[PDB]
Amino acid sequence: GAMGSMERASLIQKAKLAEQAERYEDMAAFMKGAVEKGEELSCEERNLLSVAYKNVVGGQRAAWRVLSSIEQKSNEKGPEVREYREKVETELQGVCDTVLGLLDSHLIKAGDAESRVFYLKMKGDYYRYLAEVATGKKRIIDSARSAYQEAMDISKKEMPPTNPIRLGLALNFSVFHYEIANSPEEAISLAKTTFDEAMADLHTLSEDSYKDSTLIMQLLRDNLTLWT
Amino acid sequence: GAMGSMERASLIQKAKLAEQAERYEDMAAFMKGAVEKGEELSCEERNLLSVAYKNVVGGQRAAWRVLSSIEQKSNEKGPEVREYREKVETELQGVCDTVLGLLDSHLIKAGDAESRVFYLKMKGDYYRYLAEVATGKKRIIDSARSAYQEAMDISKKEMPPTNPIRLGLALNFSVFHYEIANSPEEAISLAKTTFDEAMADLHTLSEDSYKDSTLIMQLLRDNLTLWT
Amino acid sequence: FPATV
Amino acid sequence: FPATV
Ligand SMILES: N/C(=C1\C(=O)C(=O)N(c2ccc(O)c(C(=O)O)c2)[C@@H]1c1ccc([N+](=O)[O-])cc1)c1ccccc1
Ligand SMILES: N/C(=C1\C(=O)C(=O)N(c2ccc(O)c(C(=O)O)c2)[C@@H]1c1ccc([N+](=O)[O-])cc1)c1ccccc1
């Protein structure tokens, strides 16, 4: 496509330049172009890809919530609120579909087990985002749960309980149980278990990522504090 | 164009919805569509238009500065930094040209004197932004100065010295003298005069906008404090 | 909303 | 940078 004539390494450079400029749509476009070169991503490249897209859909979700709340209080008139909400919703779905397509078409393979946990977590996250706006839907919920579950099973076996990706996966999966599948008890259990088992084996923390483990473990408590 | 089949009043509604959602590109697109209906803008509509576009180019300018600084320290290699800087620069110029075209094609007319000060200030602002990235250029500086100067002359005669648009015009024109035309003494004089004459006639403050006058007058001091 | 990463 | 509005 539009990135096809550029060197892979330049695309990676420009992705980093866009991040510094806080141009996350450009950042995602550069990383997508790099993935389409056909080469497996390094750990660093995976996380650049995730940062870019998660930042783009994050703003779309925030926007969508603002309009959905207005639309909800409008129903208690004019079609303009629904129309604009629908416009932002259709946009959000386009980006989610763009990422999920990239995951099945290119990234999810064959590859190592850590690789697979990373991508499978993204699969569950972006399916969760589509479920947040869908109706008619539970097909999307099942595929979010299945992607999450496979990611959990692999990570329990292949990664220490303090690994930031493993901790982040459980955090997000717990939220999925709560806000999506309507299972607060399962959401609470998974978050308490995840936090407790990380403390039991606190010694597995890594010099290169212990700050990310500390933060996600506080977030697990923040959600528990929020759900009591 | 793409807004042509929508009612003017719905475009105004959706512009306000996009602002609440912090979707300023959409906000600008809705307001542009409303201006293209051919009807004069109300005071409120003018300021919605300005807020939208000033917020869009603001992020582009911030991005452009980030890359220009990197590019400058790169020159003391690879072409990727220049290329991406050029890409964001070309985008910035497109939006500035979109606004300036709208000002001459539709908004600047015939209309009242307050109207003309508002639009002429926008004309000078967006010409200033093009000058910030141009070279080869002073044609752009002259047209920024001429738009600003005409706006000043009208406002000295038609608006009290505490009017927020008049105060904002002088603030921006002063900065133009400083950072664009390289005339710090003229920049300082205009900002001191503007602030002093507002205090001399502080009684002209208006119940509906005194908070905006207070703020812009502090900003005039902030720049003076910065330039001593 | 709760925390996600 | 200085202030503008
Ligand atoms: N932007 C962040 C990260 C990086 O930039 C990055 O490269 N990290 C990372 C750290 C250790 C690992 O071992 C891996 C991996 O093996 O891939 C990767 C962070 C990371 C933490 C948690 C997740 N997550 O749960 O999805 C993803 C990324 C971030 C930090 C805290 C909270 C949220 C995001
Ligand atoms: N978003 C803001 C405004 C409004 O929303 C708006 O409708 N205002 C306004 C107030 C009084 C007037 O009498 C007019 C006019 O007669 O038009 C208009 C504000 C305004 C102040 C200064 C400028 N300026 O200097 O360009 C433009 C707008 C804003 C406030 C403080 C600093 C920067 C922006």
Side-chain angles (χ1 to χ4, degrees):
Chain A
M3 301 334 288
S5 73
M6 212 185 300
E7 302 260 36
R8 187 192 194 271
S10 296
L11 286 166
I12 296 298
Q13 275 176 236
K14 297 179 170 184
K16 292 172 177 165
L17 291 168
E19 186 183 24
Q20 295 184 248
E22 286 174 359
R23 303 259 302 182
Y24 293 110
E25 293 79 15
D26 289 353
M27 196 197 166
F30 291 132
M31 289 313 306
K32 178 173 195 285
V35 162
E36 276 162 359
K37 298 299 181 183
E39 287 180 11
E40 192 165 19
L41 292 198
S42 68
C43 169
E44 168 180 19
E45 289 160 5
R46 289 200 298 271
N47 282 276
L48 286 169
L49 175 74
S50 191
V51 164
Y53 273 106
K54 213 139 192 303
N55 192 297
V56 170
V57 304
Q60 293 176 325
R61 291 170 67 213
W64 179 95
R65 291 154 164 158
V66 168
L67 298 182
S68 192
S69 154
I70 293 157
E71 195 190 358
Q72 272 183 298
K73 228 68 177 191
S74 81
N75 294 326
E76 39 167 85
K77 183 134 80 67
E80 293 80 358
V81 176
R82 171 181 59 73
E83 294 172 336
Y84 190 44
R85 188 264 300 162
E86 281 185 348
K87 184 210 177 111
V88 174
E89 182 177 309
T90 294
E91 219 169 288
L92 174 62
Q93 299 165 325
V95 172
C96 293
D97 292 335
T98 282
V99 167
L100 288 159
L102 206 63
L103 289 166
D104 289 304
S105 157
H106 276 94
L107 302 157
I108 299 191
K109 295 283 218 254
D112 58 282
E114 282 215 62
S115 267
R116 220 189 148 73
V117 175
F118 192 96
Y119 293 136
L120 279 166
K121 178 184 172 292
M122 310 181 54
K123 182 158 198 163
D125 277 346
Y126 287 92
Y127 268 122
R128 173 161 58 92
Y129 300 152
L130 294 171
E132 289 179 334
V133 309
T135 52
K137 165 172 191 211
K138 305 273 308 183
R139 203 191 307 177
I140 292 148
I141 300 199
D142 294 334
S143 314
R145 193 202 326 272
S146 122
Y148 277 142
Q149 196 62 75
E150 180 172 355
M152 294 285 297
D153 302 332
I154 303 170
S155 99
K156 309 299 109 175
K157 279 54 140 190
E158 310 269 30
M159 291 136 99
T162 54
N163 176 278
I165 305 319
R166 172 167 169 190
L167 287 173
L169 161 64
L171 182 90
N172 289 14
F173 196 27
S174 176
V175 171
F176 168 86
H177 285 304
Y178 196 100
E179 272 284 289
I180 305 289
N182 177 225
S183 323
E185 326 302 0
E186 216 168 338
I188 303 147
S189 172
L190 172 53
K192 186 193 204 317
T193 288
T194 296
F195 175 94
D196 277 337
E197 299 193 334
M199 302 233 70
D201 291 310
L202 201 68
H203 56 276
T204 62
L205 287 161
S206 153
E207 302 173 20
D208 307 338
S209 66
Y210 74 93
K211 289 193 225 177
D212 285 348
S213 305
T214 58
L215 182 121
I216 302 180
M217 281 184 288
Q218 185 61 70
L219 294 174
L220 285 160
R221 180 133 311 292
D222 290 349
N223 292 3
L224 297 164
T225 298
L226 191 86
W227 290 337
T228 54
Chain B
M3 301 334 288
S5 73
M6 212 185 300
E7 302 260 36
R8 187 192 194 271
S10 296
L11 286 166
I12 296 298
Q13 275 176 236
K14 297 179 170 184
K16 292 172 177 165
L17 291 168
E19 186 183 24
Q20 295 184 248
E22 286 174 359
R23 303 259 302 182
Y24 293 110
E25 293 79 15
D26 289 353
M27 196 197 166
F30 291 132
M31 289 313 306
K32 178 173 195 285
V35 162
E36 276 162 359
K37 298 299 181 183
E39 287 180 11
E40 192 165 19
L41 292 198
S42 68
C43 169
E44 168 180 19
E45 289 160 5
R46 289 200 298 271
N47 282 276
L48 286 169
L49 175 74
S50 191
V51 164
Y53 273 106
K54 213 139 192 303
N55 192 297
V56 170
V57 304
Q60 293 176 325
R61 291 170 67 213
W64 179 95
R65 291 154 164 158
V66 168
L67 298 182
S68 192
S69 154
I70 293 157
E71 195 190 358
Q72 272 183 298
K73 228 68 177 191
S74 81
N75 294 326
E76 39 167 85
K77 183 134 80 67
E80 293 80 358
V81 176
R82 171 181 59 73
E83 294 172 336
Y84 190 44
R85 188 264 300 162
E86 281 185 348
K87 184 210 177 111
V88 174
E89 182 177 309
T90 294
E91 219 169 288
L92 174 62
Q93 299 165 325
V95 172
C96 293
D97 292 335
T98 282
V99 167
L100 288 159
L102 206 63
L103 289 166
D104 289 304
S105 157
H106 276 94
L107 302 157
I108 299 191
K109 295 283 218 254
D112 58 282
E114 282 215 62
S115 267
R116 220 189 148 73
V117 175
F118 192 96
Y119 293 136
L120 279 166
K121 178 184 172 292
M122 310 181 54
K123 182 158 198 163
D125 277 346
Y126 287 92
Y127 268 122
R128 173 161 58 92
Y129 300 152
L130 294 171
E132 289 179 334
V133 309
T135 52
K137 165 172 191 211
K138 305 273 308 183
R139 203 191 307 177
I140 292 148
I141 300 199
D142 294 334
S143 314
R145 193 202 326 272
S146 122
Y148 277 142
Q149 196 62 75
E150 180 172 355
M152 294 285 297
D153 302 332
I154 303 170
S155 99
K156 309 299 109 175
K157 279 54 140 190
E158 310 269 30
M159 291 136 99
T162 54
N163 176 278
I165 305 319
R166 172 167 169 190
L167 287 173
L169 161 64
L171 182 90
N172 289 14
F173 196 27
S174 176
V175 171
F176 168 86
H177 285 304
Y178 196 100
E179 272 284 289
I180 305 289
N182 177 225
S183 323
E185 326 302 0
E186 216 168 338
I188 303 147
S189 172
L190 172 53
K192 186 193 204 317
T193 288
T194 296
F195 175 94
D196 277 337
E197 299 193 334
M199 302 233 70
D201 291 310
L202 201 68
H203 56 276
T204 62
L205 287 161
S206 153
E207 302 173 20
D208 307 338
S209 66
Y210 74 93
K211 289 193 225 177
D212 285 348
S213 305
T214 58
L215 182 121
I216 302 180
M217 281 184 288
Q218 185 61 70
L219 294 174
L220 285 160
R221 180 133 311 292
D222 290 349
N223 292 3
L224 297 164
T225 298
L226 191 86
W227 290 337
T228 54
Chain C
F1 289 95
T4 51
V5 294
Chain D
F1 289 95
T4 51
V5 294

